[PDB]
Amino acid sequence: SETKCTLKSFTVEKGIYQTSNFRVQPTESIVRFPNITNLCPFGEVFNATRFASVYAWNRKRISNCVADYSVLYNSASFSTFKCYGVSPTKLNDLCFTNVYADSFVIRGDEVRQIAPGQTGKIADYNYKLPDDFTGCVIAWNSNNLDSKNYLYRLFRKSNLKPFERDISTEIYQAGSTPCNGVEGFNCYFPLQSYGFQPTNGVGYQPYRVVVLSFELLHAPATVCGPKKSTNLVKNKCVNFNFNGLTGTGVLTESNKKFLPFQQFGRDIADTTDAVRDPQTLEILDITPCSFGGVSVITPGTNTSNQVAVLYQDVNCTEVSNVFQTRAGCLIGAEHVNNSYECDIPIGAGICASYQTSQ
């Protein structure tokens, strides 16, 4: 039937057809993470009593800890929660390095500027987010905390580089006047305060912004989600999750001379060849389960419906009438101590035919 479907026919001619594959399945999953003893110090980032003006935005490094992102995501307190390069749902199971939380206070109409490729006074002069960015921009209204102070850069010689924090406040020439200092006419002080008041409209209400910048799947992980490890099962097809890396295959001990600073190995296709286990620093190889490849030897259907099946690159130890040949394992055919003219070719000197009780 598989042959009939690939050929779009209810009648099959004599010969060999190539169909399906041999796809051995994983039977269980495996999860392995480094054993991290700390919970991440984020109270300081999100629930802080003071935020920087954007102009002099703060940057906090997060490391050697567990972070449950379910809580921030599910919380309804945020006005915005926009992730780039990652789904908030998936974020919880990923492991990272060099995680940073940038933070500052902005006016509500500036929310649109904290984005990878937007322009404006913040995006260009106070806080530039890279066009190439992985991470989440999370923010909420702080009118009840900040309104009664904060200064923003309006006059700058050039646009900022991503993640640049330039805080010189020197008064300088804008126009034709050859001066610095001497504010007035065409020389100006670079910043303006935008005090926040309870009477400000929403575009002028303060917002507390936290930007979480991540380096995903750097070989090490220091910041890792709340996921439990399982036992490591060897010599079976499994799913995998080595410090955030996934795939399917059979894992075995590997006699490889990894250097002390190495923890992954790669193939010519730049796919994972090997990993160093996160808890026991053993080198393990990952080999895909099986490909097979199957062709079906068919007498024409106007004669009979018996078929023989050839598994192209297998041993007759894996998968009555089983013949091992150079071309694969031929199952259902009866090998004989004879020779004849070739009819349906198989390969490597072997052919097959339908003959007599046929």
Partner: antibody, heavy 116, light 107 residues
Framework: QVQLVQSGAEVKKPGSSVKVSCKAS????????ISWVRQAPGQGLEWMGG????????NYAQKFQGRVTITADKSTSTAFMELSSLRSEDTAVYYC???????????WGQGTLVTV | EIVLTQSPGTLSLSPGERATLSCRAS???????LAWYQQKPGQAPRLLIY???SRATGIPDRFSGSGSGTDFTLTISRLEPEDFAVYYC?????????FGQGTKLEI
């Protein structure tokens, strides 16, 4: 949102143990840390020890290093503290307190008096 | 460890007066992990100030404070009779907690 609910008061005989139960209402049993604090009558507060239910890690005050075992039940969102080899010296109010990651507030239970 | 010491150990003040309680650390601490509590006999400690600032939800708003390094203060702008209480500072180091000294306030 967060509420800590503790078990009632108990009277012990010398040498026995007391197991104080603290239920975490409001959720976030995991991804938070729970500590136990004691207040002997006429005294201020002192730390006994604590646990991180998600990481399965315990930590104790040197004063209480040994005697007390702290555990956590994820399924029932409940933390426990069992203090053995009790003496009249241990008459105190035993408090449960916790903090969520991502937060700054420390939430408290009611305090349970245990006499010996 | 880091030991917190408060001062004065005891004090008698009148309602209507401004009052302050100090808290000194033997080692510098992050302001973000310091907190002040109020206690009345028979009651669980009540949080007033956290992160060495940040007035707690439901607070009377007569209380405020600040500090850094090794030196922190709790200020009551005007004492009301209800503010005469045991007060203490604590450090939530998360791996280490520090408690002690109630600077007991009486009329």
């Amino acid at each position: 949102q967060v509420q800590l609910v503790q078990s009632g008061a108990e009277v012990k005989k010398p040498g026995s143990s007391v197991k104080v139960s603290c239920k975490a209402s409001g959720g976030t049993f995991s991804s938070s840390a729970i500590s136990w604090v004691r207040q002997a009558p006429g005294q201020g507060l002192e730390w006994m020890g604590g646990i991180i239910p998600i990481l399965d890690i315990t930590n104790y005050a040197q004063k209480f290093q040994g005697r007390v075992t702290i555990t956590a039940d994820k399924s029932t969102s409940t933390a426990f503290m069992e203090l053995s080899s009790l003496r009249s010296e241990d008459t105190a109010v035993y408090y449960c307190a916790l903090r969520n990651q991502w937060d700054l507030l420390v939430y408290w239970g009611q305090g349970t008096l245990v006499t010996v | 460890e880091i030991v917190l010491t408060q001062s004065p150990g005891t004090l008698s003040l009148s309602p209507g007066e401004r009052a302050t309680l100090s808290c000194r650390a033997s080692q510098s601490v992050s302001s973000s992990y310091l907190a002040w509590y109020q206690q009345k006999p028979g009651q669980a400690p009540r949080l007033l100030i956290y992160g060495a600032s940040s007035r707690a939800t439901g607070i009377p708003d007569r209380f405020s404070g600040s500090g850094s390094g090794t030196d922190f203060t709790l200020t009551i702008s005007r004492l009301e009779p209800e503010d005469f209480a045991v007060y203490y500072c604590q450090h939530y180091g998360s791996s280490l907690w520090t408690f002690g000294q109630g600077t007991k306030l009486e009329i």
